[PDB]
């Protein structure tokens, strides 16, 4: 491999674009800093799970190269966040549907192998020159088929985080990823993020200003959440159509809307499953 351009960054890794020396195949070399922490736990987790996730909608890990450690990922051109910036405005609805198809397809695979991504956002939704969408960066992901005690992790933005997770929940299941999907969706539809919060407190408030405050009645589990407040000013849910429609060039049909509500229930158990999502009347014409 011969590196030929840096692409992004973090405190964990420095990512470059390179080339295979047999097939002309372009690759993304992800150099992981290799230390009192030994072999970055984040790598052990990524490398580990990637080997376990082969799908046409999950970025592939080709190999590992060993005082450093380079993760060789299948090179992807840009990402949902970067792809949208290029327009300026939300994407046209036939393209909005297809992208949401691809994301749910790859995630439905994760969830089937009992693995949560945990941090889905448009940067993590990479898109090749050929219009394919693939989930990437499984640093914060876990094989939840291994019943270990769950603690959440510090993330750079909270705009895609489930309200219950933000309320300190440590028994969340596969439903954490479905919330992010409903936010990814609204974003693609409108252009702007659905819950552009600044912090733990604001994000929750911003969810409740639209989704309504939690319905203790049809969600009794919420009273057990560590960051739960019984003395919140109760809010009626604002109907999503009058929030999105003003900022989407095309009319929002009923199907699209039922689908969207199905993803953005407050109560995890009311949240649609990835499998169930892919058989919603909204995706009928794909069959």
């Amino acid at each position: 491999f011969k590196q030929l351009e840096k692409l992004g960054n973090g405190t964990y890794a420095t990512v470059y674009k390179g080339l295979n020396k047999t097939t002309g195949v372009y690759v993304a070399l992800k150099e992981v800093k290799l230390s009192e922490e030994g072999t970055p736990s984040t790598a052990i987790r990524e490398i580990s799970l990637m080997k376990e996730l082969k799908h046409e909608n999950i970025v592939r890990l080709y190999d590992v190269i060993h005082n450093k450690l380079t993760l060789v990922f299948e090179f992807m051109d840009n990402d949902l966040k970067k792809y949208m910036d290029s327009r300026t405005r939300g994407l046209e609805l036939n393209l909005v549907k297809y992208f949401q198809w691809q994301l749910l397809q790859g995630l439905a695979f994760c969830h089937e192998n009992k693995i949560l991504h945990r941090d889905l956002k448009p940067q993590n939704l990479l898109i090749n020159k050929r219009g394919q969408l693939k989930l990437g960066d499984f640093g914060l992901a876990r094989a939840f088929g291994i019943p270990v005690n769950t603690f959440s992790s510090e993330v750079v933005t909270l705009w895609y985080r489930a309200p219950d997770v933000l309320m300190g929940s440590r028994t969340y299941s596969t439903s954490i990823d479905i919330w992010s999907c409903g936010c990814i969706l609204a974003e693609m539809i409108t252009g702007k993020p659905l819950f552009p919060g600044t912090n733990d407190e604001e994000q929750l408030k911003l969810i409740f200003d639209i989704m309504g405050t939690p319905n203790e009645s049809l969600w009794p589990s919420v009273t057990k959440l560590p960051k739960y407040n019984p003395n919140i000013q109760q809010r009626p849910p604002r109907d999503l159509r009058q929030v999105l429609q003003p900022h989407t060039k095309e009319p929002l049909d009923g199907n699209l809307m039922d689908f969207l509500h199905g993803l953005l229930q407050l109560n995890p158990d009311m949240r649609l499953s990835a499998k169930q999502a892919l058989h919603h009347p909204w995706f009928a014409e794909y069959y």
Binding site: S48, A143, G145, I146, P147, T150
Partner: protein, 214 residues
Amino acid sequence: GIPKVILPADFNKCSRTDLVVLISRMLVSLIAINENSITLTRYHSKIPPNISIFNYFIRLTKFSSLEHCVLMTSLYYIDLLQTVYPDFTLNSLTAHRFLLTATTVATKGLCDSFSTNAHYAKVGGVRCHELNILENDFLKRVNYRIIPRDHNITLCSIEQKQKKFVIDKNSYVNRPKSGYNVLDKYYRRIVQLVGSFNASPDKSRKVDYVLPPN
């Protein structure tokens, strides 16, 4: 006469002192057999350490907050390494260093709460660097295939670097619990083999262990 504690079906709902006695038991039973039956490895000590496996095992547990599934995983990692690192056999020269290693790869690999190698090396008795290369060794030999799953070992064996022979030697769908049936399988096994008081490390904890016949 000796106490008779009945364990639960789910190993998580079970005292992790019990698991540390159950595993240690299984460990010295392997150590006896594998021996009473030589290119060295990184898991080799110059001489058998003067601390029994159990007393070393609880220590790691107490002062590194080793979760249950990690304790089960640790045991499993023997069968892994023993199947894919020809050179490696569990024996009174490999137990400790292997254990220290396994333990801290299981945690860092599979868990949400974890320490630094520098923390783990201290409790384990080794220099930090000792543990770093010891951790790196394992990950290379196992090809990072650390998630205990039904077909994991096989897939690890297949993903090895393969000798070319003249004659070639010749999806978790529908599989129960998506192929995460390994750690229970091990839990049930050690209660079946070393569950009674007749194994070898009698000294450790005087108890017979039962598991409801279900």
